[PDB]
Amino acid sequence: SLSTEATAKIVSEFGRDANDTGSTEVQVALLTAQINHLQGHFAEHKKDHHSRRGLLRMVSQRRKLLDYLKRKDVARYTQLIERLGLRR
Amino acid sequence: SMQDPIADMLTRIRNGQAANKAAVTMPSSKLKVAIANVLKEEGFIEDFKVEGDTKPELELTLKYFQGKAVVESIQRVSRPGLRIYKRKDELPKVMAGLGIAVVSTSKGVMTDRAARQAGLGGEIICYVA
Amino acid sequence: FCRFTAEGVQEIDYKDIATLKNYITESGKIVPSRITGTRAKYQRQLARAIKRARYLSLLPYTDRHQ
Amino acid sequence: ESFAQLFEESLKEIETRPGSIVRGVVVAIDKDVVLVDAGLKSESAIPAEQFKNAQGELEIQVGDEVDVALDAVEDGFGETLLSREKAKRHEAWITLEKAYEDAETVTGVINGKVKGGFTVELNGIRAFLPGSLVDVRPVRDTLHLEGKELEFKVIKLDQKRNNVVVSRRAVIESEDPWVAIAKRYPEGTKLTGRVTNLTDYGCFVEIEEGVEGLVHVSEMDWTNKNIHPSKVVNVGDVVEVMVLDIDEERRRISLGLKQ
Amino acid sequence: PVIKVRENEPFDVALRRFKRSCEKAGVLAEVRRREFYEKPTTERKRAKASAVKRHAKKLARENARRTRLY
Amino acid sequence: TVSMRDMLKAGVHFGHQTRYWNPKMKPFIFGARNKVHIINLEKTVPMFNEALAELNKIASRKGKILFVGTKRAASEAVKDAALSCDQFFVNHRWLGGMLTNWKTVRQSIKRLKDLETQSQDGTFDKLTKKEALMRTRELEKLENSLGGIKDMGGLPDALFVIDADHEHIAIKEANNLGIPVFAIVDTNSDPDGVDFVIPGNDDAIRAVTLYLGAVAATVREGRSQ
RNA sequence: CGGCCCCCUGGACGAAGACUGACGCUCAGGUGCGAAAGCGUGGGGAGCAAACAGGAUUAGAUACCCUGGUAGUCCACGCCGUAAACGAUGUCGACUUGGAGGUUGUGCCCUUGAGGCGUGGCUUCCGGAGCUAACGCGUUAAGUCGACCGCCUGGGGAGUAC
Which Gene3D superfamilies does this one have (chain F) (predicted)? Predict the structure, then answer.
């Protein structure tokens, strides 16, 4: 998983409240951090299909959050992707 | 997931009548409620009561005559996978009319015979018998 | 009537030999969950602790070996 | 009304689960079945052998009141665990009474040790005690007139498993089972144990504080195979048994009865 | 099952105890199960059938026990 | 006629273990303290009274009454009660289709009566011993079975029963013939067959005796009418 | 999928609370995993064992039995994609009498004891209504309802031929 303190950080940066924890942008970036962390493991271990499944689940949940965010509001979407450096 | 609450209501009524439950309860809705109005108005039920502010809870009180249930049968006719609209001239009869068929029309919800009298068709929600 | 449950121990110590010894066969097997009277949850901890001690030679695997 | 609700909690208040409240009136006697009614769902099928006192004949006619026991309820139609155990609690209370003044006095008469402690019998029941308890010193009641009259002064009791060794003569003088299973061990320590259920291969006498003994079918008597243990001993009765074998590991203490 | 004759211990008692000990260990039977290979399926089958039988005896026989024979 | 305190004393309120109940008895149940169902006497008593009224009403029109019970613990009481108001009973086991297959049972009554006539009025002794034992064996069997009813002549005008679940055969038979049915119904039993159901304690002795005595007095009252 | 340890890691459940606010179900095409056997290549090779040799039996015995026994079975990376891959029971959601269990939580209770009363999840058995051609299924349905997909149209020829 992700370290708790890492989550607390990501929250501080992206949550408008730092107690909210449920902001779409927040959840996006949490997923993003987790994907980033998991990239190295799967680079090393190319055959752990099992966990690779949950990884992909994270990716999808991220994408869906992004779709929701796109429709709801575009400026927020754009800044978020900028911050995360996500291509789309 | 829940796809039709009208269906859920009819099933719950069916099962309460089946099980000899005095009353039955479920989430409340406007259409649900006007249906309960109707059924009372046609004396298949003793009374309904909606309760709650936020997610209010409708409660029908069932009816038993000489022991056996009073809604002999209740069955939906329209449904989300297949809706059922009729013209006034096309209004069925339930049980050769010994029953009723709930219908929505532009002038609210009401049984088939009241609709005939009014002179206007609509959506046949369900037969009751 | 599980001793670990009324004593209320949190965990079972492989280091504590003799309380284990209470639960072992003169041959060194582990005595039967369904026939012993120790609760299941504590039971598995007991088996784990026995195994550990065995590895450490504190306990024998069996009576015979040497 | 709430008359009935209040009456229910009232009737809860005026009964308890064990054989404590002497309530069942004997409402039919026939050999060999007594029957009471202690305010339970059904009447007990009582044996006659929980009610004859010390020489074999009955003591209680119609209307008489003994409590029985409980905590076991209905496989179909019937009620209670026998009232004789009831009696055990009374015996326990008298034994406990000692603690108050540090001396329980009755009569104890102990001729010999089945397993290292003279046997003492109080009223109807007879109990077994560890070897020291019978005599205060090294006096030994073997030279005393047989089955002599003293009292019992307590030497030792095991507090969980019920073994009590008591003090004859000398009036002037005044987890848990199978951790240290070496007390009744050494080869042949005789015990007094009530049998529980006879499983057509066995008899299951088991008394000494949460253990299990068998006395299976081979000994039981001095005939081997044609015996059928239900014919030969009893149901629910305290008998002659000793260990012959303990495995403290696969908790099978294998007692015997041919001794 | 290791055993030692106690001092002044009858031989036949010693042997009886030797038997009791081997019996406690359940060793003969363990040899019996390890003479020939059993298939996992069949192992399962034996065990589950036994447990099925077990429930049968405990419950249906008691229910029968409730009724008197004659 | 009967009073609630008397029933309480009789332990009518007691019922069967709460793993042996029939949901059809919930309405007649009050609660279940001690893992044993209690019978609402508040609900019971009016119904017992109604049944007593109807029984008296029958006995007034010269109604035949049958007392069913074979628990083997109260057989004596049921029989004595039957005798009290002089009605009919079956204090031992239920014959399959006694009522439904009455006619054949009537032939059987007649055989029994002939054997009785032989035993007492015949005074004809000098019969071979073995045949003697056989006639007497038959007499004893037939008197155990068919004693009370022998003089019923026809079918009965109503049916009183002690344990409906143990006597469901009789109950089904009255239903098929439609004889009125008056059953002491415990928790674990079923009411559906019963025209007039009595929520009470089949099992207990004293309660049964109480039921029986009240019934017998009401029949004697109807007969006096 | 089962000896013991370490390292990476997936899910489920229960407790209270906090948050979003319909974001959901299903799914042709499509992608992915996919027993055992088997193939490729490179290692490995105790046991066992197709094939194979012998010895038996038998009319005969290319078997069953006995003695040997090679590929394989194991390890690394690939392919293969099929099974009685079975609950011969597609997925999601709701509702409907009971019992006895097991396993795993968790609330409360003098735990006065291995206990008393509840509340969650998964799970074995029996059985009521109901359903069923019967067998049986039966709150884990094969009952009563909704949504989407999937498949069936006499036997063979044929799950074959092109």
Answer: Glucose-6-phosphate isomerase like protein, domain 1, Helix hairpin bin
CB-CB contact of F223 with F61 (8 Å):
no
Task: Give chain A residues 39-78 with Cβ within 7 A of strand G.
Answer: 41, 45-51, 53-54, 57, 64, 68
Which one of D176, D247, D248 has the shortest CB-CB distance to C1? Answer: D176
Residue D46 DSSP code:
E
Q: Tell which residue, D95, D124, D107, has the closest CA to residue D167.
A: D107
Strands F66-68 and F88-90: parallel
Chains F and E touch (3+ CB pairs under 8 A): no
d(CA D227, CA D215): 13
Q: Which domains does chain A have, with CATH numbers?
A: 1-88 (1.10.287.10)
> Is E58's Cβ below 8 Å from some Cβ in C?
no
- DSSP structure string for A67-83: HHHHHH-HHHHHHHHHH
Q: DSSP secondary structure string, chain A?
A: ---HHHHHHHHHHH-SSSS----HHHHHHHHHHHHHHHHHHHHH-S--HHHHHHHHHHHHHHHHHHHHHHHH-HHHHHHHHHHHT---
Enumerate residues 6+ apart whose C-beta is below 8 A from E60: none
The reply to whether C27 touches chain E by the CB within 8 Å rule is: yes
How many angstroms separate the CA atoms of C58 and A22, rounded? 53
Asked if C4 reaches chain D (Cβ–Cβ under 8 Å), the answer is yes
In three-state form (DSSP H/G/I as H, E/B as E, the rest C), the secondary structure along chain F is CCCHHHHHHHCCCEEEECCCCCHHHHHHECCCCCCEEEECHHHHHHHHHHHHHHHHHHHHCCCCCEEECCCCCCHHHHHHHHHHHCCEEECCCCCCCCCCCHHHHHHHHHHHHHHHHHHCCCCCCCCCHHHHHHHHHHHHHHHHHHCHHHHCCCCCCCEEECCCCCCHHHHHHHHHHCCCEEEEECCCCCCCCCCEEEECCCCCHHHHHHHHHHHHHHHHHHHHC
Query: In sequence order, what E strands does chain D have?
Result: 24-25, 28-30, 33-35, 46-47, 65-66, 119-122, 125-128, 154-157, 164-166, 193-194, 238-239
Domains and CATH numbers, chain B: 1-71 (3.30.1370.30), 72-129 (3.30.1490.10)
Distance of CA B69 to the CA centre of its chain: 15
Tokens of F17: 């273990």
Tell me which method was used to determine the 3D structure.
cryo-EM
Choose among E20, E26, E62: nearest Cβ to D75. Answer: E62
d(CA B14, CA D169): 84
Q: How far apart are alpha carbons F125 and A79 in whole angstroms?
A: 123
Resolution for the entry shown, Å: 3.7
Q: Which of residues 71-100 of D touch C (CB under 8 A)?
A: none
**Min Cα separation E40/chain D (Å):** 26
Tokens 């029958």 sit on residue? F58
Question: Chain D 30-59, CB below 8 Å of chain F: which residues?
Answer: 39, 41-43
A5's CB contacts (< 8 A; 6+ apart) are none
The verdict on a CB contact (< 8 Å) between C31 and D251 is yes
DSSP 8-state assignment for residue E68: -
Q: Which residues contact F188 (CB under 8 A, 6 or more apart)?
A: F15, F16, F20, F21, F22, F25, F165
Counting every residue, how long is chain C?
66
Q: Which residue of F has its CA nearest to D8?
A: F33
- Partner C contacted by D251 (CB < 8 A): yes
Query: Residue C2: which nucleotide is closest by CA–C1'?
Result: G114
- Contact at CB, F31 and D27, closer than 8 angstroms: no
